[PDB]
RNA sequence: CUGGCUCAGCGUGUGCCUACCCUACGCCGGCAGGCGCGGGUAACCCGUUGAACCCCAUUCGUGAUGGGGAUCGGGGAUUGCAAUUAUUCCCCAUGAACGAGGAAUUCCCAGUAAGUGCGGGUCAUAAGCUUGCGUUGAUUAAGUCCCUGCCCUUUGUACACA
């Protein structure tokens, strides 16, 4: 019953709508929900030179890429939450349903 | 002129020695150098330098054996040969007396000039 | 102690700034009565916010200088504490009162500067502001004690005690009063 | 205790070396070429010598015995990895060196590598940088 | 130019000065005593620690950087 | 009522080192007279019976935070590796010194190598440490 | 042996060992997060990988 | 210099071809290291990241000194298929100039300058560089066109590839 749905996404409002959708689906299917626990955002940071040559003033580019991680833990037999999580998928987020 | 000695070992006792005693004899870098493995990969050419040196003539100085090596330790086995060690341009004609033991075969060359 | 706030163990009240001019830009009495020289600050926020820093903290700030000692206020607080002990022994006065007197006696009244009728140039004499008086007074007796202690057995705490005693006196022996009188002399020589 | 005792050895002599008595003993015996602060402190430990005294105040019997300590290391239970000449090419004996003995072995070792014609010896002959330093902009006070 | 050669141990008359004089000073510090007797800071400290344990000078504050004593009170 | 945190933690190491020197059943190695305490150090300890000072320091660190190994003791006794002309860096303490001090405090029943790695403090040790804390509080009162 | 000599030299490390996954040259490589794309090629394709100039 | 006491924040971490990861802990060695079983694809394990400066207590005492650590000698480990023209690191010994720096010139106004160390890049080995991070933390100024630049309006022209 104790099953772990984690959502890893680069875009935030996408992830938030998926987090909302799984709470909606859970409270409708009448099963105990642990709310969307927000793990710290990881900021992948790469900083390079701008110029292809080396005949300019030393200006650097600061490239960032945030990656967000939510998880909701439910008390439900595999099936009903599997069919809840088989609907309403968008390209931004990525799903993991963990049983044990 | 008084017959010199390695660590506390007579020059013919250095000659009458297996590699693990000769390891403990000379300095640390050279102990690791020979302990790492044996010469039948890249140092198939070290098996060739063994061959070349141990092919010695009668009572007269041996033929100058040219070498494209600088990364070769001089052991008691190789003492008393004429060798050309490669400068990149030239082969440097030098003999390796027993004072060159535990030294790199390259370490007898100069390339440049003082103005 | 809900009434009086003895600076470590030195009384706040019964210290009087005699000079009317330097009275506003010297904080020692009644509301700037604090236990430590150390504090947060925010005295570099606006223009004349600096005038409200306790003079003991102003001295503690000015002391930590010459590169190797930039931002060692704990070491500077212990130097000021040891100096106040030594002042009290040799003098027998309130060390805060001796400091206030040394600040007054060291601050110049007139300085030389470059002015106009723009074309060529001219070095005339001008006044120093009551803030500039106290600013340069602190700097002079800090650098006086500093350079005196450099390559010497006399420790920084002893050199500070020497400068503050001799400057509060008006000796011309402290680097403070010596240099003050040099600037006021040049200021006169071309007025 | 604190007034100058009689026979205060102001100017001591340890292997033809004019050592000061005014300096503390651990930092005084390092005037000898081949002993530093490290080797001085461990020897003045090994010989049960109180190092709270100055080099004027110690006794002559204590100067003699501690000179025997400095020349004889292993007779007084000192490590082999502590020595400035370890596993020599000639005698194969790990032995500490003192004042003039260093200058002897240093002169020998420079002439040694010079005559056996090692590139290290060649740079030592030319008086250049030998441990592979870039000399494009360094060692200029050397050659005027 | 000029050089400073302080004593590593007391001369008889310098110790006679120290035993008589330094308990008359208002400020007693190893730096003051070092200058006032031509003695190294090591000697100054050791001498003033004698004077204190002996029970002659009143200590005001000790610190690794600064140790201050004064002459003991009269009445 | 007194415990270790009620007293000045500076003189507590002196008091325990004095107590452990009096006991003098502390399996002190023979290289003590010749050793340097970390590679970042230049000289040997000025003090001559330093082992019992470090034994006191190790014991009270196992009081405050239990489950410490020797790698934790190499870390905690780190300082500046002053690299002559290159910039300074952080360097750890010595493995052998910290390990044999823990093993000298194990040779005496004052520590206990607890599960999940590291050494914890034994009931005898905590009793010992708190009693001498009471002795230190009494001396300074 | 020609085929004992052609690719005889070993390449386990150095910048002769690792290669730009786009242009295949051996200067200013990004190896962070397993990119393996030379800094110029990275900067060209950076917005497509997901990297964005924010700060 | 030697002990003791006490506090961080950014990160990163096992690989496509690609081999090389971050390391706790238990023994061995003074040291750099070696061997053992483990955790970790990471708010989970290294980790409560016991960092340095600073702080407290000693030894030193104005001496080119226990300042400073260049140069040089000897031995020992690690990385690699291979280190001499020393990769790096460790142990003993050697102890150079340098006593605050001429003309000239640089960066900078608040958690800023500066001191201080820790991560990322390069990386088999690897920071005196650079790119970020926190810790300690000021003096001076709230002004001007004097200096160096650039920018505008008026005016003059026989210039307009100016």
Swiss-Prot record, chain A:
One of the GO BP terms on file: translation
Keyword Metal-binding carried by entry: no
Protein's cellular compartments: Cytoplasm
Residue positions where Phosphoserine is found in the record: 76
Entry keyword Acetylation: yes
Record keywords, A-Z: Acetylation, Cytoplasm, Isopeptide bond, Phosphoprotein, Ribonucleoprotein, Ribosomal protein, Ubl conjugation
GO CC annotation terms, alphabetical: cytosolic ribosome; small ribosomal subunit
Organism lineage: Eukaryota, Metazoa, Chordata, Craniata, Vertebrata
Post-translational modification: Polyubiquitinated by ZNF598 via 'Lys-63'-linked ubiquitin chains when a ribosome has stalled, initiating the ribosome quality control (RQC) pathway to degrade the potentially detrimental aberrant nascent polypeptide. Deubiquitinated by OTUD3 and USP21, antagonizing ZNF598 activity.
Protein name, UniProt field: Small ribosomal subunit protein uS10
Family stated for the protein in its record: Belongs to the universal ribosomal protein uS10 family.
UniProt gene name: RPS20
The protein's assembly and partners: Component of the 40S small ribosomal subunit.
Role according to the record: Component of the small ribosomal subunit. The ribosome is a large ribonucleoprotein complex responsible for the synthesis of proteins in the cell.
Modified positions (N6-acetyllysine) in chain numbering: 17, 58
Main localization (coarse): cytoplasm
GO molecular function: RNA binding; structural constituent of ribosome
Swiss-Prot record, chain B:
Domain of life: Eukaryota
Keyword Coiled coil recorded: no
Cross-link Glycyl lysine isopeptide (Lys-Gly) (interchain with G-Cter in SUMO2): residue positions: 97
Subcellular locations according to the entry: Cytoplasm
GO cellular component, one term: cytosolic ribosome
Keywords assigned by UniProt, alphabetized: Acetylation, Cytoplasm, Isopeptide bond, Ribonucleoprotein, Ribosomal protein, Ubl conjugation
GO MF annotations, alphabetized: MDM2/MDM4 family protein binding; RNA binding; structural constituent of ribosome; ubiquitin ligase inhibitor activity
GO biological process, one term: translation
Principal location class: cytoplasm
Family: Belongs to the universal ribosomal protein uS19 family.
Protein's job: Component of the small ribosomal subunit. The ribosome is a large ribonucleoprotein complex responsible for the synthesis of proteins in the cell.
Complexes and interactors: Component of the small ribosomal subunit.
Name of this chain's protein: Small ribosomal subunit protein uS19
Upper taxonomic lineage: Eukaryota, Metazoa, Chordata, Craniata, Vertebrata
Curated annotation (Swiss-Prot), chain E:
Predominant subcellular localization, coarse grouping: cytoplasm
GO cellular component terms, semicolon-separated: cytosolic ribosome; cytosolic small ribosomal subunit; nucleolus; postsynaptic density
Record's keyword terms, sorted: Acetylation, Cytoplasm, Ribonucleoprotein, Ribosomal protein
Modified residues (N6-succinyllysine): 12, 54
Assembly, per entry: Component of the small ribosomal subunit.
Family: Belongs to the eukaryotic ribosomal protein eS25 family.
Protein function: Component of the small ribosomal subunit. The ribosome is a large ribonucleoprotein complex responsible for the synthesis of proteins in the cell.
Protein name listed in UniProt: Small ribosomal subunit protein eS25
Native source species: Oryctolagus cuniculus (Rabbit)
Gene that specifies this protein: RPS25
UniProtKB/Swiss-Prot annotation, chain F:
A Pfam family annotated for this UniProt entry: Ribosomal_S19e
Protein role: Component of the small ribosomal subunit. The ribosome is a large ribonucleoprotein complex responsible for the synthesis of proteins in the cell. Required for pre-rRNA processing and maturation of 40S ribosomal subunits. Part of the small subunit (SSU) processome, first precursor of the small eukaryotic ribosomal subunit.
Modified residues (N6-acetyllysine): 21, 109, 113
Cited PANTHER family: 40S RIBOSOMAL PROTEIN S19 (PTHR11710:SF0)
Localization in the cell: Cytoplasm; Nucleus, Nucleolus
Gene Ontology annotations for the cellular component aspect, listed alphabetically: cytosolic ribosome; cytosolic small ribosomal subunit; nucleolus
Gene label: RPS19
Protein name: Small ribosomal subunit protein eS19
Any GO BP: translation
Family, per entry: Belongs to the eukaryotic ribosomal protein eS19 family.
């Amino acid at each position: 019953h104790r099953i772990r749905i984690t959502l890893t996404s680069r875009n935030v409002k996408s992830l938030e709508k998926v987090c909302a959708d799984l709470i909606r689906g859970a409270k409708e299917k009448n099963l105990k929900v642990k709310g969307p626990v927000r793990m710290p955002t990881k900021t992948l940071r790469i900083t390079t030179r701008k110029t292809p040559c080396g005949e300019g003033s030393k200006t650097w580019d600061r490239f960032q890429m945030r990656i967000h991680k939510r998880l909701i833990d439910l008390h439900s037999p595999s099936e009903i939450v599997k069919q809840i999580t088989s609907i309403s998928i968008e390209p931004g987020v990525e799903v993991e349903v963990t049983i044990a | 002129f008084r017959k010199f000695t390695y660590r506390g070992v007579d020059l013919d006792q250095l000659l009458d020695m297996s590699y693990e005693q000769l390891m403990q004899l000379y300095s640390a870098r050279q102990r690791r150098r020979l302990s790492r493995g044996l010469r039948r990969k890249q140092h198939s050419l070290l098996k060739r330098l063994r061959k070349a040196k141990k092919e010695a003539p009668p009572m007269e100085k041996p033929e100058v054996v040219k070498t494209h090596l600088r990364d070769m330790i001089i052991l008691p086995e190789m003492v008393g040969s004429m060798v050309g060690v490669y400068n990149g341009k030239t082969f440097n004609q030098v003999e390796i007396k027993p004072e060159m033991i535990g030294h790199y075969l390259g370490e007898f060359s100069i390339t440049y000039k003082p103005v | 102690t809900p009434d009086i706030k003895l600076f470590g163990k030195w009384s706040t009240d019964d210290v009087q700034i005699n000079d009317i001019s330097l009275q506003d830009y010297i904080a020692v009495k009644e509301k700037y009565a604090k236990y430590l020289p150390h504090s947060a600050g925010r005295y570099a926020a606006k223009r004349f916010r600096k005038a409200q820093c306790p003079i003991v903290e102003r001295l503690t700030n000015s002391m930590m200088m010459h590169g190797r000692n930039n931002g060692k206020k704990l070491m500077t607080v212990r130097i000021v504490k040891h100096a106040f002990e030594i002042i009290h022994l040799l003098t027998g006065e309130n060390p805060l009162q001796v400091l206030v007197n040394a600040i007054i006696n060291s601050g110049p009244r007139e300085d030389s500067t470059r002015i106009g009728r723009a074309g060529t140039v001219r070095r005339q004499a001008v006044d120093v502001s009551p803030l500039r008086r106290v600013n340069q007074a602190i700097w002079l007796l800090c650098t006086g004690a500093r350079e005196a202690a450099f390559r010497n057995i006399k420790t920084i705490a002893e050199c500070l005690a020497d400068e503050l005693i001799n400057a509060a006196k008006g000796s011309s022996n402290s680097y403070a009063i010596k240099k003050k009188d040099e600037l006021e002399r040049v200021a006169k020589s071309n007025r | 205790s604190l007034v100058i005792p009689e026979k205060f050895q102001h100017i001591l002599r340890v292997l033809n070396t004019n050592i000061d008595g005014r300096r503390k003993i651990a930092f005084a015996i390092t005037a000898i070429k081949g002993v530093g602060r490290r080797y001085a402190h461990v020897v003045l430990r090994k010989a049960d010598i109180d190092l709270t005294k100055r080099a004027g105040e110690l006794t002559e019997d204590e100067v003699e015995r501690v000179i025997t300590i400095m020349q004889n290391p292993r007779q007084y239970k000192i490590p082999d990895w502590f020595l400035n000449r370890q596993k020599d090419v000639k005698d194969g004996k790990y032995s500490q060196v003192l004042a003039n003995g260093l200058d002897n072995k240093l002169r020998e070792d420079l002439e040694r590598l010079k005559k056996i014609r090692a590139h290290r010896g060649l740079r030592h002959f030319w008086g250049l940088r030998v441990r592979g330093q870039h000399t494009k902009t360094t060692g200029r006070r050397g050659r005027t | 130019r000029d050089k400073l050669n302080n004593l590593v141990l007391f001369d008889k008359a310098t110790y006679d000065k120290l035993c008589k004089e330094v308990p008359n000073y208002k400020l007693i510090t190893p730096a003051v005593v070092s200058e006032r007797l031509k003695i190294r800071g090591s000697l100054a400290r050791a001498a003033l620690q004698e004077l204190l344990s002996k029970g002659l000078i009143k200590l005001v504050s000790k610190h690794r950087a600064q140790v201050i004593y004064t002459r003991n009170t009269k009445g | 009522g007194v415990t270790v945190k009620d007293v000045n933690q500076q003189e507590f190491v002196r008091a325990l080192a004095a107590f452990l020197k009096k006991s003098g059943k502390l399996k002190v190695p023979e290289w003590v007279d010749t050793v340097k305490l970390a590679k970042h150090k230049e000289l040997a300890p000025y003090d001559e019976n330093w082992f019992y000072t470090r034994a006191a320091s190790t014991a009270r660190h196992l009081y405050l935070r239990g489950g410490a190994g020797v790698g934790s003791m190499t870390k905690i006794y780190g300082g500046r590796q002053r690299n002559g002309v290159m910039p300074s860096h952080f360097s750890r303490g010595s493995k052998s010194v910290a390990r044999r001090v823990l093993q000298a405090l194990e040779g005496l029943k004052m520590v206990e190598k607890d599960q999940d790695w590291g050494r914890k403090l034994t009931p005898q040790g905590q009793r010992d440490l708190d009693r001498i804390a009471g002795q230190v509080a009494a001396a300074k009162k | 042996g020609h085929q004992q000599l052609y690719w005889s030299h070993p390449r386990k490390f150095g910048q002769g060992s690792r290669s730009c996954r786009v242009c295949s040259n051996r200067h200013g490589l990004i190896r962070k997060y397993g990119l393996n794309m030379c800094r110029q090629c990275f900067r060209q394709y950076a917005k497509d990988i997901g990297f964005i100039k924010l700060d």
